[PDB]
Design a protein around this nucleic acid. Sequence first.
DNA 1: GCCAACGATGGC
DNA 2: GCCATCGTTGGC
Length: 53
Amino acid sequence: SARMCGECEACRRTEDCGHCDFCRDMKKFGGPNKIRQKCRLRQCQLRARESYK
DNA sequence: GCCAACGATGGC
DNA sequence: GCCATCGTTGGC
Ligand SMILES: [Zn+2]
Ligand SMILES: [Zn+2]
């Protein structure tokens, strides 16, 4: 992907942390789905927008 | 330039 | 049709 190196810790992570702002936004964590980004811990360390990590 | 919010769509 | 999560935008 443009935003995934597929090779760092973040990219290999399969489990949302459930605790960050992005996770708390998610439907599966009871959130309003207004932000719509991946878990902070799954934000590619190389390729993600710097503000997402 | 940032970012909260949202439109878009590939993949299922 | 839905979902995950991307790129875009308007307001600051
Ligand atoms: Zn998280
Ligand atoms: Zn990565």
